[PDB]
Amino acid sequence: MSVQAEIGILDHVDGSSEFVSQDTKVICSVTGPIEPKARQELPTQLALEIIVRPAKGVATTREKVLEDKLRAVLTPLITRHCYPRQLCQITCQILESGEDEAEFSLRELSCCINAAFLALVDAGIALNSMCASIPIAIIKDTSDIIVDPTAEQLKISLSVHTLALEFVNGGKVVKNVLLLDSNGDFNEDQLFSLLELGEQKCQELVTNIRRIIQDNISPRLVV
Amino acid sequence: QDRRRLLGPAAAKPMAFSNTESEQELSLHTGFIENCNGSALVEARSLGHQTSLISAVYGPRSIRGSFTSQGTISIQLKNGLLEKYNTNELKEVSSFLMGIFNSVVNLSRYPKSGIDIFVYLTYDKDLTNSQISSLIPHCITSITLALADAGIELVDMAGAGEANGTVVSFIKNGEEIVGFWKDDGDDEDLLECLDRCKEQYNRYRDLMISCLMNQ
């Protein structure tokens, strides 16, 4: 869980970030609230334009799924009723997969969730709470649950998991499970053991994120 | 290949196989698609060729483009699962069908509105161990059923028939013609085709009315 992030790296965007876990590096940018296109307009709430760009080649249907899952996480996080008939552009440029993209998209999704959240924080957009996402995997010979697995570990995995939780009260109370994307062969006992260990490492991540956010933003503010 | 679909590997090549008058019966169903305003299922089986096509009517709905005293109608044919036709040929039939139902649909009752009619050529099997001409009368039957099922006003039950590559659609008990189509065929066979098609037109119209009423 030795992640590293930077905040406010882009000039022509309201907010930006660069999240790095292992070899997975994703840069994200957020502009909003701004004027929306007519087809995007929502009478009462904020409209989200979510874009995911791959590390190699052009955006395909694969990234279209990454956009969809990332939408399921960011939508309830943002206090959308504060910005009626308005738009918020959220762009993720995956710079380095950190995994075999022909087989997995686990680490890229988690890194996009964490980066998007950080970019939303930087942009100063109304959020109902905080959030953290981690990738998890299981190995058949080992029987182990490995949090933040490497690319080599994924190759020999039986199941891959993306867990993103919603935290409140100083990152101590799990408000809800924003996203759990479990793929592969697994049983009910493995699922809850995954959720128990997953919640712990997620809570540790929020604490680390809270540290990063305060370290970067506080110099900008005044005492 | 395509960034919007999964078409598989490019080095892959499709599987190619090797070698080692007649009465017509049809089945009719309407209103089985909750997604739209009107829909119809038309299935026909005869000799060495069966056809199962589905029609769907969406309208009257809003038109962005222009003001209109009367309604606007669009027809699009889509290729089905296995049998395939040229896009040009499907466009041509669409145009031919537009002309027909612009003579039947009471457009005056739908100002600034759009009636979009879709016909899915779902299953067209060719069992012979321009074929599009034999599908045309079944399309008109489906669109007529779908429009009537949608509640769109029609001057008369438009039906048609096919005989030796010649297709002609009738209204008003076969007194008048709302469309004439002819590919291939023979010479000076107009009178024979008109009679044979009117017989099919009459049979289709009876089954259509029977379907719109009893069902």
Binding site: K155, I156, S157 | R5, L7, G8, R61, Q76, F118
Partner: peptide, 28 residues
């Protein structure tokens, strides 16, 4: 073994009809 590198898949094209004409929706 039971690793993912030894398994294939089908390539599906799903089309949903809703009375519109144009490019593939995000749903499809």
């Amino acid at each position: 073994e039971d690793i993912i590198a030894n398994y294939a898949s089908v390539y599906p094209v799903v089309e949903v009809e809703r009375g519109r004409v144009g490019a593939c929706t995000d749903e499809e």
